[PDB]
């Protein structure tokens, strides 16, 4: 594909009176998951979730295990620090999410890096696009930001994001080439569903595509139907491909006013579909 991403996503949830927080981390290359760690699991190891990552040797699995476990421990500490910062009790359950990773272009060069936290679903602190400073969302996050400035955390993360992260993504793309580099275009079709004597539904389908990024839209007389289109979230088929549909309610006999438009990276050119009974 024209660009690629490696992202790790972690979720820590406190369990007051039930032991230490649950910590789950997952790694993705683009829309393909390749590792997981779950503090509930018996192995206490980073575990493979894509075939091509099993090409990595024992050193990898030991090192990655050590790193994700250090992260889980620091985020348990961070949940406790947040309680102090927000004057919250030890009785309530709270969530801390982290996302980090990097985007590289098809030429193999670094494009963008990420390192950001949310607390109870709200932005807390995020590394800015130039990788030199922080967006801190509220009073508590300014305290963290001051600490991270003093310790030069942005430089540490910049070095990781432009170095290790990029190098890791390139390697995975190499080992997982046969599947990671595919741009499988959607298979498309349209269905028609009478609602009454006055109205019918036209539904435009996109099936079997990868990566997940897609644009599916309805036009009427060449005009976007933004505020009248039912559009479901892009969804996994379970076999490595994605699905989506868009539907409009059309007055009887007016089907030929409507066109469905499909953009996807695997398509030679954008598609335009018309109802053809």
């Amino acid at each position: 594909a024209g660009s690629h991403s490696m992202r790790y996503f972690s979720t820590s949830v406190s369990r007051p009176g039930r032991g230490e927080p649950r910590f789950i981390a997952v790694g993705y290359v683009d829309d393909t998951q390749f590792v997981r760690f779950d503090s509930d699991a018996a192995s206490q190891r980073m575990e493979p979730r894509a075939p091509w990552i099993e090409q990595e040797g024992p050193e990898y699995w030991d090192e990655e295990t050590g790193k994700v476990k250090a992260h889980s421990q620091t985020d348990r500490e961070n949940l406790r620090i947040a309680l102090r910062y927000y004057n919250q009790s030890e009785a309530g359950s709270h969530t801390l999410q982290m996302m980090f990773g990097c985007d590289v272009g098809s030429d193999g060069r670094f494009l963008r890096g990420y390192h950001q936290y949310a607390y109870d679903g709200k932005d807390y602190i995020a590394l800015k696009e130039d990788l030199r400073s922080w967006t801190a969302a509220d009073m508590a996050a300014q305290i963290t930001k001051r600490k991270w400035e003093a310790a030069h955390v942005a430089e540490q993360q910049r070095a990781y994001l432009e170095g290790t992260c990029v190098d890791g993504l390139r390697r995975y793309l190499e080992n997982g080439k046969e599947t990671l580099q595919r741009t499988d275009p959607p298979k498309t079709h349209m269905t028609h569903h009478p609602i009454s004597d006055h109205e019918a539904t036209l539904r435009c389908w996109a099936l079997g595509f990868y990566p997940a990024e897609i644009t599916l839209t309805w036009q009427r007389d060449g005009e976007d139907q933004t505020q009248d289109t039912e559009l479901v979230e892009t969804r996994p088929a379970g076999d490595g491909t994605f699905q989506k549909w868009a539907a409009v309610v059309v007055p009887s006999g007016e089907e030929q006013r409507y066109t469905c438009h499909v953009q996807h990276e695997g398509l030679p050119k954008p598609l335009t579909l018309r109802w053809e009974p």
């Binding site: 490696m6 790790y8 790694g27 980073m46 990655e64 790193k67 994700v68 250090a70 992260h71 620091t74 985020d75 500490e77 961070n78 620090i81 947040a82 910062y85 982290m98 980090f100 390192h115 508590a140 305290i143 963290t144 600490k147 991270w148 310790a151 955390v153 540490q156 993360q157 990781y160 994001l161 290790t164 992260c165 190098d167 890791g168």
Partner: peptide
């Protein structure tokens, strides 16, 4: 390749 985080 996993990164690392700091304390709040």
């Amino acid at each position: 390749r996993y990164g690392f985080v700091a304390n709040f």
